[PDB]
Design a protein around this ligand. Structure first.
Ligand SMILES: C[C@H](Nc1ccc2ncc3c(c2c1)CCOC3)C(=O)Nc1ccc(Cl)nc1
Ligand SMILES: C[C@H](Nc1ccc2ncc3c(c2c1)CCOC3)C(=O)Nc1ccc(Cl)nc1
Ligand SMILES: C[C@H](Nc1ccc2ncc3c(c2c1)CCOC3)C(=O)Nc1ccc(Cl)nc1
Ligand SMILES: C[C@H](Nc1ccc2ncc3c(c2c1)CCOC3)C(=O)Nc1ccc(Cl)nc1
Ligand SMILES: C[C@H](Nc1ccc2ncc3c(c2c1)CCOC3)C(=O)Nc1ccc(Cl)nc1
Ligand SMILES: C[C@H](Nc1ccc2ncc3c(c2c1)CCOC3)C(=O)Nc1ccc(Cl)nc1
Ligand SMILES: C[C@H](Nc1ccc2ncc3c(c2c1)CCOC3)C(=O)Nc1ccc(Cl)nc1
Ligand SMILES: C[C@H](Nc1ccc2ncc3c(c2c1)CCOC3)C(=O)Nc1ccc(Cl)nc1
Ligand SMILES: C[C@H](Nc1ccc2ncc3c(c2c1)CCOC3)C(=O)Nc1ccc(Cl)nc1
Ligand SMILES: C[C@H](Nc1ccc2ncc3c(c2c1)CCOC3)C(=O)Nc1ccc(Cl)nc1
Ligand SMILES: C[C@H](Nc1ccc2ncc3c(c2c1)CCOC3)C(=O)Nc1ccc(Cl)nc1
Ligand SMILES: C[C@H](Nc1ccc2ncc3c(c2c1)CCOC3)C(=O)Nc1ccc(Cl)nc1
Ligand SMILES: O=c1[nH]cnc2c1ncn2[C@@H]1O[C@H](COP(=O)(O)O)[C@@H](O)[C@H]1O
Ligand SMILES: O=c1[nH]cnc2c1ncn2[C@@H]1O[C@H](COP(=O)(O)O)[C@@H](O)[C@H]1O
Ligand SMILES: O=c1[nH]cnc2c1ncn2[C@@H]1O[C@H](COP(=O)(O)O)[C@@H](O)[C@H]1O
Ligand SMILES: O=c1[nH]cnc2c1ncn2[C@@H]1O[C@H](COP(=O)(O)O)[C@@H](O)[C@H]1O
Lengths: 351, 351, 351, 351
């Protein structure tokens, strides 16, 4: 019997061909939609629907109270980071709620300290708890999701993550998750892929997770690797219901941290929560910077405008119809020309 | 049942593998043709044939009256842009017609203002109206094509675009188009692919559009992404009858705009019609510059000379025979060496 | 009958599609393992098991007595290079043994001088002889392995290499090898691939060698091409039992050679044993430098920490279970973003 | 019926997947050969065998009398260029013959002037005439080959080229060619691929030409695209019997032209015969420079040493056995690391 063409005799050892955002484009289709008439609302969890399908990352250079307030007023939501004392994180929940009863989420870990943290966040009025781990396919993480749903599931929605396979998504569904968050390795500041050699390209990861979550009516959050407004449309077309953003929002005025004027240009700090500086395990993130991008409200306008364009091109009046759109796969020659190919750019572009 | 190897259980979710110009080369074939004896004429529309199968883009940094006159004298045609008052665009049609009864086209949009614009262009003597949109697969665009053909179709030829699929091309054929223009996302100044995440590699887009248009006798115009004279031969071999050029003609003396002397070299401005500067919707084009290339007549000579070489290599005495030629697909290793590989270039090359 | 799509009529002329480390990632799986509880021990040979599955290369800029002592104290082993007089190499074996009865190996060639060298190394107390060649699929190399096993196989373990195919691995098994070393062409300082045009991508080479060695109970050593801690996890998941490292250990304090302070940064020399300088045949290696990395103990801690992370993600409590893990294949678009994509790195990272 | 996945309904429109040298490596195999015992002789034509399987290109910056003498003394042969008067080219043939009865070839074109040129070269004692064209699949080129074989075929061997397909090779065989030269588009100074859009990756081109020529006993010359000594071994393993070199020999002392000292380094001019400067048709080559490489004898020693290494690794005692070797295909990740990957090179390498 002949060998597998990539080696050995086991045809499942190399189990899939993984695609990322840069591997695909959305195909145009018959349309009665123009960008102005599209409806961008979508489910975050079983019980919570957002006007704009975007949430901010649970990172100490992205989301504290100011970012959470701005995201909710823009039609989305923030998830408050957990690298601070319990009493401080609960106090930031209260600040958001005192600003008009806006929606807000907060991250917790696994264990006894995470349990006390969760209970205080619920008492402060949080709307969504996010069980926030690098590898949710573990009975200890699944147990935390189920116990929270048992104790406080009548008062708050419970998200679990992160996963990158169909079987891991199915395990979170069976544990009672109200939404499943997808992304192992794709983040802009991530080094898991080179430190551990572990990961999963995000378009294939979303397609596989959706195959378990959609038949059960559980929404999927696409978390990490989004670099452009067009990546939001690709993630939702693959079947996700919302997208979580770190790098694209870290440059805004509302993100924590001070402006950095260096060599006449302006930047802000952005770092992984598994970086050496955040942990103070071998590190699995870097510490860096991103260009300054101005007010959050202006960034969200550009991002939703790109999503609305995609809905016009694909004939999608709602996000539920966008989830039925088709892709074409592209080669390396097709990608390299999508970044403005061969024209000395002379003026600024907002998107 | 086993999953699709790229994810999920739907084998049509990723519907095709899209090829662009850099993915293919034309195979040599048995030949009684040398470059001097080839015939480059081809249909622009059902009723109009050109001596050279090239038209200039409807852009305010490419085609006004001077470019339209030069293109017609060289054996091709210009399409006048529509980012100016109706009375000014109609006046430029008259200037061209006063220069020897040369052929000329003009762009119009969709709606009531576009209707008055179209009627004035017809009164001024235009030969071709181009219904000029980003996404022609919409009943409002199809309706405009059909109404123009109904009202003035005896006096003028009507083109519709742009499309990138077989089903969209078929819809324009059924609406009565005299030619179908292909290109969603491929232009050198385009950012649709990153802003909306939407597009289609141009060799596959032409192959699919031709599968609908050729059986109906409707010519296809390949619009956008052509970077070299060899790309013209590839587009026509895929089944197109003419090609539309922006970047390759924006550097010429006849294009609108002033020379730019910077750092001892010379350039000219070139910008998308969906850029912030042209629109004065989130932008879907950039504003930039290209190197100065001299007189139009000299550029067209180099472009047609490359096409004539391809006709010799493939044994094609006419464009209709070139449309029957075959491709070989190449890998990333093959492309990277096609741009002069590993020889410090010391002298200028005209093509 | 139709041709093979890549040319000719022989479907076995291009016999396989070869994958390297950068072509694959490990998929996360169901897990009861966290990095702290993983067990990293593994077989070097039939009779020798290591606490950490890493050995240092037999190169005159990587392993003499100081490196061999440090590797053994860290739980791995060193292989002493053979570019020095027999009496000097045997003396370095004694120095290691005088430092606590630590484990040590030593390289030998093929022929009569290599035979006297081997006998002196055995008298000095070496634990492992490595028959060290560029192409072990030769009866002269197979003969050396068998004769050593016949004469001294009761006192010492005998490794043979290097190979890159299933048939070559099977020949070493039949000759009596206690372990088989895999790698023809992959090393960081290797030029065999461009000088001779010969090689085999290392993930496919390991998969093929394991298909012959695992059914016979013979461990496989993955030798060359490892650039990151994650590559260790990939090599072992493909079926290898240990990995051999040159570049990743050449920068350490214990490697032979003096520090190089140039332009404010620090480096150390690193060269192939088939380079012109080492041979003093056309050369098949280069002479270069690598950044200084500090104490060996600190480098091994970072490398094993990355391996432990991979064991947590894949649910592997032992190396024998890691050898059963699955891969996903990635495209060029997926790789280019795994090296920290689009975030100006500002702080140092240890791994 | 479903479409072809790359577009349209014709499965032969994209007819093959073309591989170049960088797409493949030679697999090691069972061997009783070391580099010193290999035999590198091979047929140039039906009646002429060379000791080293290499010829120099017919270019006015590569081969005049000095290069032809040095190539013959090294065991190969030169082909004299034809961009000079007939009386001068015939005089250079005589100079070579006066230096010891060495072997020599000379290029001619097609037509009446080429006929007089050919007759004078034969009277001067040339051993091989090369009918030298860009596209030999034409009855006018086939006619020239047949007429020369009819008139002078008893006294001289007749080569025809260039071709890139099985059908074109078969046509030259039927016309009576004594050898067939393969290469449309691959040369380092070629711009045919971008000017005309025409070409064929060279490993696939050789495989296809050999499928026609080997059953007829007609040797194949691989012409263009060879960048490293390892590329010679790849070309011969694909079935060619000799290789023709331009860039790799243009830097030598014996090549025509003067040394160029610029910025402390030394270069020499190298240009295509279809460049603007050589023709004094749109140009299909560039004018450039290459690094100075010293005496020819030293370059040929390095090239044959790399070939001998490949023969050891593949178990080939003769070139006829090397023509039976197997390839593994590699990905972009495998190639990028074959050029010395990630080690600051500090010393010079001869190959
Ligand atoms: C469930 C458990 N969660 C915690 C929470 C707080 C801790 N606080 C302090 C310490 C430990 C803690 C573990 C364990 C190590 O000793 C100190 C845990 O295993 N988490 C974990 C393990 C490995 C990796 Cl890679 N990532 C995360
Ligand atoms: C994302 C999380 N990993 C870490 C790792 C190190 C940390 N070090 C310090 C701090 C935090 C850390 C979180 C969180 C914020 O407070 C400081 C994580 O994967 N947990 C986890 C829990 C249980 C299981 Cl079974 N597997 C994994
Ligand atoms: C050190 C490392 N720190 C973080 C922190 C936050 C993260 N947030 C999101 C993601 C990752 C994160 C890693 C990694 C995967 O991509 C998503 C971490 O906890 N490693 C880890 C390894 C194995 C297992 Cl069993 N448990 C945990
Ligand atoms: C058919 C229709 N054409 C026009 C023409 C002129 C207009 N002039 C002014 C304004 C509008 C106009 C629309 C609409 C917005 O309000 C101001 C239109 O929908 N075109 C359109 C919509 C969305 C996108 Cl992305 N691209 C183009
Ligand atoms: C190409 C065209 N898009 C735009 C967009 C914004 C513009 N903004 C300003 C101006 C122009 C603009 C054209 C044209 C020139 O005058 C100024 C377009 O796609 N129209 C269109 C019409 C109907 C439908 Cl259903 N879908 C799309
Ligand atoms: C803002 C944007 N402006 C332009 C202007 C001219 C163009 N000309 C040609 C092409 C494109 C163009 C885009 C985009 C696709 O490639 C071809 C545009 O109108 N967006 C748009 C989006 C969705 C829908 Cl339903 N309607 C229109
Ligand atoms: C088995 C044999 N081993 C030795 C050992 C020591 C030597 N010492 C000196 C010399 C030779 C030696 C050969 C042979 C050449 O003359 C001088 C040998 O053939 N090894 C070899 C051959 C070709 C290549 Cl590429 N790599 C390695
Ligand atoms: C790795 C080994 N190749 C070389 C080549 C040249 C050398 N030149 C000088 C020195 C050494 C060399 C080793 C070793 C250290 O001493 C100096 C090798 O492949 N041997 C080998 C033996 C038998 C057969 Cl059948 N095939 C190959
Ligand atoms: C000159 C060259 N020198 C070395 C030295 C050490 C090496 N160590 C490991 C590896 C290689 C090495 C090459 C090359 C393949 O990758 C693994 C060598 O001996 N060439 C060689 C060629 C053909 C045959 Cl039959 N015998 C030997
Ligand atoms: C067979 C024929 N050979 C010659 C030879 C010498 C000539 N000398 C002068 C001139 C011509 C010549 C043609 C033809 C053009 O007028 C001047 C020819 O057609 N060769 C040719 C044609 C096109 C291309 Cl692309 N490459 C080569
Ligand atoms: C390689 C050859 N092409 C050229 C083109 C232009 C030239 N211009 C000037 C000169 C030479 C030229 C050769 C040769 C040297 O003298 C000066 C060629 O393909 N011929 C050819 C002949 C017959 C047919 Cl049917 N097809 C093609
Ligand atoms: C202008 C151009 N000049 C050269 C000269 C020497 C060459 N030598 C070798 C090769 C090529 C060469 C092109 C091109 C293909 O690759 C091999 C040439 O003659 N074009 C040409 C085009 C079509 C036809 Cl029918 N006839 C000839
Ligand atoms: O240190 C880390 N390593 C890996 N992933 C991380 C780390 N910190 C945060 N993440 C993930 O990266 C996401 C942000 O990715 P980005 O939007 O591509 O910048 C977060 O929402 C987390 O899921
Ligand atoms: O802003 C824009 N976005 C996208 N495509 C555009 C825009 N403006 C013009 N185009 C298209 O780009 C073509 C020119 O492409 P190029 O020849 O590759 O420079 C035009 O003929 C239009 O079809
Ligand atoms: O000159 C040489 N050419 C090719 N491979 C070599 C040479 N010297 C050593 N090697 C191999 O390269 C390995 C180290 O590779 P690295 O860890 O990628 O730097 C060694 O363990 C040998 O197997
Ligand atoms: O102007 C030209 N265009 C294309 N190919 C050329 C030209 N001049 C020479 N050649 C070919 O290029 C080969 C040399 O290629 P190289 O060895 O890769 O530099 C010659 O032997 C010819 O077959």
């Amino acid at each position: 019997t002949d060998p597998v063409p990539t080696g050995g005799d086991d045809p499942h050892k190399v189990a899939m061909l993984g695609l990322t955002f840069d591997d695909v484009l959305l195909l145009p289709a018959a349309s009665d939609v123009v960008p102005a008439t599209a409806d961008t609302s979508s489910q975050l969890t079983k019980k919570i629907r957002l006007k704009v399908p975007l949430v901010s990352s649970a990172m100490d250079t992205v989301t504290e109270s100011r970012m959470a307030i701005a995201m909710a007023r823009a039609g989305g939501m923030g998830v408050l980071h957990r690298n601070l004392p319990v009493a401080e994180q609960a106090g930031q929940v209260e600040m958001v709620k005192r600003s008009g009863g806006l929606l807000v989420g907060a991250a917790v870990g696994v264990g006894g300290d995470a349990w006390v943290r969760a209970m205080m966040l619920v008492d402060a009025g949080v709307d969504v708890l996010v069980v926030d781990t690098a590898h949710a396919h573990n009975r200890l993480v699944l147990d935390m999701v189920g116990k929270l749903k048992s104790e406080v599931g009548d008062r708050v929605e419970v998200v679990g993550g992160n996963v990158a396979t169909r079987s891991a998504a199915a395990a979170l569904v069976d544990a009672g998750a109200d939404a499943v968050k997808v992304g192992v390795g794709p983040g802009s500041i991530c080094t898991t892929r080179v430190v551990a050699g572990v990961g999963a390209p995000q378009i294939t990861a979303i397609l596989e997770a959706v195959a378990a979550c959609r038949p059960a009516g559980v929404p999927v959050i696409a978390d990490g690797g989004l670099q452009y407004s067009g990546d939001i449309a690709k993630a939702l077309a693959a079947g996700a219901s919302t997208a979580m953003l770190g790098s694209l929002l870290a440059g805004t005025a509302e993100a924590p941290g001070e402006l950095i004027f260096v060599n006449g240009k302006q930047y802000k700090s952005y770092r992984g929560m598994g970086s050496l500086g955040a942990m103070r395990l071998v590190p699995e993130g870097i510490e860096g910077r991103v260009p300054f991008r101005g007010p959050l409200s202006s960034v969200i306008h550009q991002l939703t405008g790109g999503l609305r364009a995609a809905m016009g091109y694909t004939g999608s009046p709602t996000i539920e119809v966008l989830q039925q759109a088709q892709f074409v796969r592209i080669t390396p020659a097709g990608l390299k020309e999508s970044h403005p190919h061969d024209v000395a750019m002379t003026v600024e572009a907002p998107n």
